[PDB]
């Protein structure tokens, strides 16, 4: 019965990737989507999503995912705890994934500077599961190539391939943990070797929502959704670019000033 | 860190199934499990079923599920918003999933006399997903034929025959509606066919409570549990016996008075 959206705030387009996996996993569930594109240390990021979080509830949203790795890092726990409508991150589900996937305890997460910085995935992991090592990998040059939309570039298969040198041989499971790099999966799965079982937090999130949609009773009607809305705080021409080619298919997206 | 025992509130030995996956797929949790072999309409069973939640909570469980189709259908939610701990049933995990696997749209639950009067799966499913064709079908003499463990009896068999023919080539889906169900699966396999996609319900609800425990941050210590306590009503002797063949290993079985 629940027709209201699930929320999702992000810290610019990567977040669509768990956006794609919602449509393509729960096709009749209704979208709200803000990433704040602009903006840019750590309490001042919580500030940020917090601001992100109160505009998704002002979009009447029965569930609030946080779709970037470093807010999850930084504020998920808070604004979680302190809102009755349910809240999850990517995060701890990609965790979760790892944990239970890897053969040796040899696990290697990957991601954004600030989301390393953060180490929340090493925390977590090594918290559910103190036994487990877990070589975290900042990972600069991903996200960039992945707007760019060339990431068969043989220039950019280098990046990948330089950028993972240090974890090749040393894991059993490898972690994505940014939202951007799903894009760059192939490329990533080549340079591991197929012995590297690779986690997709985002997509590992989407299917958790299903299960807490259930949980909460707060399903939509899975017969029925087309009332798809995007907001971005900046570039919304280009953002219209990217998220046009990723869900195939021109969207529409509107400009907001928090 | 929370190492409180997950409890589980069953009408007999049936549930332990529900158990088995638990043990399998989470082999850190703690198990409370309590089977209410003895007692035996509607409004009645409510208080019973309450009677066992409120054993559960003296035991200091962090989370309580009805390992029970007819329980679930009948206290489920109640118990669920009484309590601040989580609550799942096993009942709407196995309508989701069966939801999820139909490709025609027609699918047939089968379970319990009691199960099937209440008639929560079909209530469940055309309330999700209102356009799938449910067919319920009682089988009332699976249940003795799983306690008396001679499945493989091609007596057995023949019950198995007989029952399903109603639903034989009529369904794409099948729900195992009843915890027992599951020990006579390859039986029921064979009857309806490679075609027709089986959904055990209890092991459903096990891949539910992983993500729950997530979600509200209660796991136990993944590398630790061996102090599982169970608890019956009556028959505590016949309990040890079913029980230690299931679970592959005697177990102590404590015999409770409410
Ligand atoms: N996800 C990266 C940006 C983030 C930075 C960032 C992290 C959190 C934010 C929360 C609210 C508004 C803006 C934010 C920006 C990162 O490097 O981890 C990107 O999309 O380029
Ligand atoms: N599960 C069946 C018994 C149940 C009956 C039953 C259903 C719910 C109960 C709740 C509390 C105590 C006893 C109960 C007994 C059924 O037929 O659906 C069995 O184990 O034989």
Chains 1, 2 share one sequence.
Not at 54 to 72: G, P
Not at 91 to 109: E, F
Request: hydrophobic share 45%; aromatic share 6%; charged share 20%.
């Amino acid at each position: 019965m629940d027709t209201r959206p699930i929320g999702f705030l992000d810290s610019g387009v990567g977040g669509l990737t768990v956006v794609c996996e919602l449509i393509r996993q729960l096709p009749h569930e209704k979208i709200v989507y803000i990433g704040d594109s602009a903006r840019a240390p750590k309490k001042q990021i919580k500030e940020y999503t917090w601001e992100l979080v109160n505009f998704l509830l002002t979009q009447n949203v029965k569930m609030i995912v946080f779709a970037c790795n470093t807010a999850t890092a930084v504020a998920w726990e808070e604004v979680k705890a302190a809102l009755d409508i349910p809240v999850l991150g990517v995060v701890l589900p990609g965790a979760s994934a790892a944990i239970k996937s890897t053969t040796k305890g040899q696990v290697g997460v990957i991601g954004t500077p600030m989301t390393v910085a953060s180490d929340i995935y090493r925390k977590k992991i090594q918290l559910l599961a103190p036994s487990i090592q877990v070589r975290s990998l900042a990972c600069p040059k991903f996200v960039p190539i992945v707007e760019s939309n060339e990431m068969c570039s043989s220039i950019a298969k280098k990046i990948v391939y330089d950028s993972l040198a240090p974890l090749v041989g040393k894991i059993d499971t490898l972690v994505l943990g940014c939202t951007h790099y799903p894009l760059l999966r192939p490329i990533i799965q080549n340079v591991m070797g197929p012995s590297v079982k690779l986690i997709d937090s985002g997509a590992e999130c989407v299917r958790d929502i299903s299960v807490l949609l259930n949980y909460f009773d707060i399903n939509g009607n899975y017969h029925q959704a087309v009332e798809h809305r995007f907001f971005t705080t900046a570039n919304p021409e280009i953002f219209q670019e990217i998220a046009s080619i990723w869900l195939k298919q021109k969207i529409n997206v509107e400009h907001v000033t928090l």
